[PDB]
């Protein structure tokens, strides 16, 4: 089962962004440690920044109350789009690795034209995937 | 053999409003009422859409 187009993964607790793999060895959820941490470094930075801006009278304090609530809305906007941007980078981070050794199923999943064991799976996840290693295997199976 | 790319979801009921949308459900949010508007929820987590 998919996959980020159709919805979120309740099975994955250890990350904001991740992979799910199924093969002869097993099926499981894994977190992408790099991209999530970057995001946290990012999310936290804005949050610290937002707080810093914060510190006739009833009347003016109502003005100020306004100032925050607007800021929240901007940053909440900026935030969710930041994630949406990031999930895209990851899919594509992967799509750029696999090329035609795999099929893009659509809805955010990939199905391999070659056999993928846990070691190859990991190579995909860490950005060291060896396209030529399986590329001959993949070319044939497509046909 | 398959691999999937996905995002996090959970049973968080927290909701926030953004410019374009109102009451979006998210995985985690922080409430800034420590230091009024009654709701000053700021999203940290991502949008909650379970499978």
């Amino acid at each position: 089962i998919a996959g980020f187009t159709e919805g979120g993964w309740t099975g994955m607790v250890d990350g904001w962004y991740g992979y799910h793999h199924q093969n002869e060895q097993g099926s499981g959820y894994a977190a992408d440690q790099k991209s999530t941490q970057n995001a946290i470094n990012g999310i936290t930075n804005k949050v610290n920044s937002v707080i810093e801006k914060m510190n006739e009278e009833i009347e003016s304090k109502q003005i100020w109350c306004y100032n925050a609530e607007l800021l929240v809305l901007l940053e909440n906007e900026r935030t969710l789009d930041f994630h949406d941007s990031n999930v895209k980078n990851l899919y594509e981070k992967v799509k750029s690795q696999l090329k035609n050794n795999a099929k893009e199923i659509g809805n955010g999943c990939f199905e391999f034209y070659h056999k993928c064991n846990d070691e190859c799976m990991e190579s995909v996840k860490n950005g060291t995937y060896d396209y030529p290693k399986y590329s001959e295997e993949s070319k044939l199976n497509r046909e | 053999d398959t691999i999937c790319i996905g995002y996090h979801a959970n049973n968080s009921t927290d909701t926030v409003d953004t410019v374009l949308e109102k009451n979006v459900t998210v995985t985690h949010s922080v409430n800034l009422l420590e230091n009024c508007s009654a709701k000053l929820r700021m999203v940290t987590g991502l949008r909650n859409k379970p499978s």
Partner: antibody
Amino acid sequence: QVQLVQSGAEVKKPGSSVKVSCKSSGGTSNNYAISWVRQAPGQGLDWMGGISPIFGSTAYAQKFQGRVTISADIFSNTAYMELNSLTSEDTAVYFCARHGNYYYYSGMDVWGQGTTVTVSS
Amino acid sequence: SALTQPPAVSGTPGQRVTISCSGSDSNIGRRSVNWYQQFPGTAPKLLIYSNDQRPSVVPDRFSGSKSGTSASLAISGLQSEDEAEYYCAAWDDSLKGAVFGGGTQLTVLG
């Protein structure tokens, strides 16, 4: 440079509860996972649980579950450990530690001085 | 203890000595390994993480390895200051918790 600052040593009669504090001094740790680890006197390390405030996680050891309340505060850069239903067996030295990243898989590279807590009737 | 460590090890100065960690598949088998160094009455220090990675400040004579459900920490050219208690650690998939070895006492008898 980041530093972890814990409340001073505590002593309690059994069955009461004690809450121990951890301040991130000289920077924030909100973007990190933090764990509470206890050392009984002359004993090995024992994981109690952890919290990652921005990530949105609160985690518990199975054994300390239902008895411990771990909470955090992003504004003050402070993490809390609360242990309940104290007994003599809960007498130990309690540490806070900051991980390499947001989650508990990474090695813990910054440690608080530790706070000693002793339970005697 | 989910992780198995020898109670004590000994070495003379200049020797290479090794410390063992025995686990099951639920922890070391599926998780990265961390090593900690502790001087008496003081807080622990992180020595090795992710099985073989070493912090920049730690002398090169420290090294780590992991095989199967067991791990080994190697200190070559042992020195008097290395005398301390050593803990292996890993995440445990069955327990959903960090687990620790019983602790290992290294003695540098010079």
